């Protein structure tokens, strides 16, 4: 049996004036598989917010989202615990829609972690908007991902900078798996492989 | 809900001045700790000056101590970087950025909105 539940993104409904997924609000996402809006994960979330009453976000309560399955909107992450190498509470996200977009141009937004893989293992495609995935000091395989495989509408493009050197990356061991496909990887793993050869 | 948006830059002498204004709209009426923040090519981003939101706590990186002064407008929602006796050393793209919250912070980790950036070019 096959159960698929909806919940409004942040900026929407019972998250109106929403800034971030924080402590407060992050119980509602429970169970969800479909965010009908934006998910945004930024700094305030992890220190706190006195002037919302906001107490900071217990790290290991990011794995709710991990039911996520798909998201009408955009996806930005700004802001993520260090001692997690990959947004494994993503790890089933299949689908951004993009019918919302950051800046009204990005689906998909990464910035300034410290993570070293994306871990997006299962998606599959990204609808609308470009993809921007910078100032990631430590991220590789990124730039292994054959973005066009996953893209829908025509002018999608990524912009995909100062981040880990690939250089750096392939002197370390981190590289796609032998199994993977040409079509990249996001992560060390066959079951980060795009595609298995 | 904050946009920011820097204006003021372009091309300078040295020990000229020049005075870089950071505009912000949308849901404004809360708290925010902007700061400044500068990324010369190649070099990474770094941190340049921060201001709280009553205006009472401001922070200055070494490298422009003296030179560089910060303050806010809350009526006017608006953060200027009042920059003096500028060096090629100063050439990079100045970005503004807010952070939820009454302080500042000299990292640009701790920054939820950014703007898109505005070039200052110090020539001879």
């Known amino acids: 049996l096959e159960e698929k539940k909806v919940c409004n993104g942040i900026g929407i409904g019972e998250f109106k004036d929403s800034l971030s997924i924080n402590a407060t609000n992050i119980k509602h996402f429970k169970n969800c598989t479909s965010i009908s809006g934006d998910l945004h994960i930024l700094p305030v979330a992890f220190r706190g917010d006195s002037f919302t009453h906001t107490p900071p976000l217990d790290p290991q309560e990011l794995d709710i989202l991990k039911t996520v399955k798909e998201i009408t909107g955009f996806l930005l992450i700004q802001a993520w615990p260090e001692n997690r190498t990959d947004l494994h509470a993503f790890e089933n996200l299949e689908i951004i829609r993009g019918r919302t977009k950051q800046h009204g141009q990005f689906s998909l937004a990464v910035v300034s972690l410290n993570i070293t893989s994306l871990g997006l293992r299962s998606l599959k495609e990204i609808s609308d908007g470009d993809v921007i995935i910078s100032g990631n000091k430590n991220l590789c395989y990124a730039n292994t991902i054959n973005w066009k495989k996953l893209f829908g509408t025509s002018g999608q493009k990524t912009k995909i900078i100062s981040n880990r050197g690939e250089n750096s990356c392939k002197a370390t061991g981190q590289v796609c798996h032998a199994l993977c496909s040409p079509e990249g990887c996001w992560g060390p793993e066959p079951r980060d492989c795009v595609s298995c050869r | 809900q904050v946009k920011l948006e820097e204006s003021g830059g372009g091309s300078v002498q040295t020990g000229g001045s020049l005075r870089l204004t950071c505009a912000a709209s949308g849901r404004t009426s809360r708290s925010y700790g902007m700061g400044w923040f500068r990324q010369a090519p190649g070099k990474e981003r770094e941190f340049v000056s921060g201001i709280s939101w009553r205006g009472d706590s401001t922070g200055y990186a070494d490298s422009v101590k003296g030179r560089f002064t910060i303050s806010r407008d809350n009526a006017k929602n608006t953060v200027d970087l009042q920059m003096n006796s500028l060096k090629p050393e100063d050439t990079a793209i100045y970005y503004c950025?807010?952070?939820?919250?009454?302080?500042?912070?000299?990292?640009?980790?701790?920054?939820?909105?950014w703007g898109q950036g505005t070039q200052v070019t110090v020539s001879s």
């Open positions: 950025a807010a952070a939820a919250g009454s302080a500042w912070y000299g990292t640009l980790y701790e920054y939820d909105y």
